[PDB]
Design a protein around this ligand. Structure first.
Ligand SMILES: CCCS(=O)(=O)Nc1ccc(F)c(N(C)c2ccc3ncn(C)c(=O)c3c2)c1F
Length: 267
């Protein structure tokens, strides 16, 4: 009935995670776990009921490509415990350790992430923050998507680091709720660009606000020409489809997924 891990059962160890939202530690609870201790004062409802409501979102997910929610902690503090992933994140592989993936593997990472996304969308979950930092490469073979949890915690107790993945309608903080299925798709288009170019977009602009203004007004978009010349002829078009400026013109993941598997049977 309950996934509440009682006080003293978990063993928080070496610190790895940082930033806002929360702090991420490697733990030990029935083996190596990940614990995301969202450092927030000491609630007290609504907060308690709000945390438990966000946890109930995570419980809806059971998929090889979605990070395994293992349990949550309220007692020693508020926290989410998931499986620990062996290996690095996609962002780290591509942009730090500079790992050069074989073209079939790159297509596979893409296929898998799209797969994981298709699932979330089916279970009526909008990620709201798909980026290569959040795509974990487990045992260097399985794609695990994470950080989709909370976001109500992000709004009820409160946006400066995911710029590159943000779709136009999101970038320009316009109508109250810009987040959609298609919003996640553009973000996917960006991670596709990351995969196919091994680069972050807009590296030749040094002014972040300028990126923000232009992307949001659709004057500037990712440079599709930079994809390596051994890239499939039809991968470039799928990427362009996902990155459409108007959100109405973007595919959904069932369709996206079909295109990857179609071009997969071409290598
Ligand atoms: C499944 C519910 C979605 S959620 O609750 O929104 N995301 C979520 C929850 C707890 C975490 F520790 C991590 N991360 C951040 C995490 C997890 C495992 C990791 N394993 C290894 N390494 C090196 C990590 O950095 C690492 C980070 C998450 F992304």
């Amino acid at each position: 009935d309950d996934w509440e891990i009682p006080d003293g059962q978990i063993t928080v160890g070496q610190r790895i995670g940082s930033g806002s939202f929360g702090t991420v530690y490697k733990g030990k609870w029935h083996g190596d776990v990940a614990v995301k201790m969202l450092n927030v004062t000491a609630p007290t409802p609504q907060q308690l009921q709000a945390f438990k409501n966000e946890v109930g979102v995570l419980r809806k997910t059971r998929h090889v490509n979605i990070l395994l929610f293992m349990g949550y902690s309220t007692k020693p503090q508020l926290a989410i415990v998931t499986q620990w992933c062996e290996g690095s994140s996609l962002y780290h592989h591509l942009h730090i350790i500079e790992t050069k993936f074989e073209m079939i593997k790159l297509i596979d990472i893409a296929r898998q992430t799209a797969q994981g996304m298709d699932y979330l969308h089916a279970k009526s979950i909008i990620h709201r923050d798909l980026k290569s930092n959040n795509i974990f490469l487990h045992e260097d073979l399985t794609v695990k998507i994470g950080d989709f949890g909370l976001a109500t915690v992000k709004s009820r107790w409160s946006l400066s680091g995911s710029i590159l993945w943000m779709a136009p309608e999101v970038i320009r903080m316009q109508d109250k709720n810009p987040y959609s299925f298609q919003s996640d798709v553009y973000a996917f288009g960006i991670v596709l660009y990351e995969l196919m170019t091994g680069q972050l977009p807009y590296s030749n602009i040094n002014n972040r606000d300028q990126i923000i203004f232009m992307v949001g007004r659709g004057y500037l978009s990712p440079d599709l020409s930079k994809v390596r010349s051994n890239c499939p002829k039809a991968m470039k078009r799928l990427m362009a489809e996902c990155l459409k400026k108007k959100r109405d013109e973007r595919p959904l993941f069932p369709q996206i997924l079909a295109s990857i598997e179609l071009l997969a049977r071409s290598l």
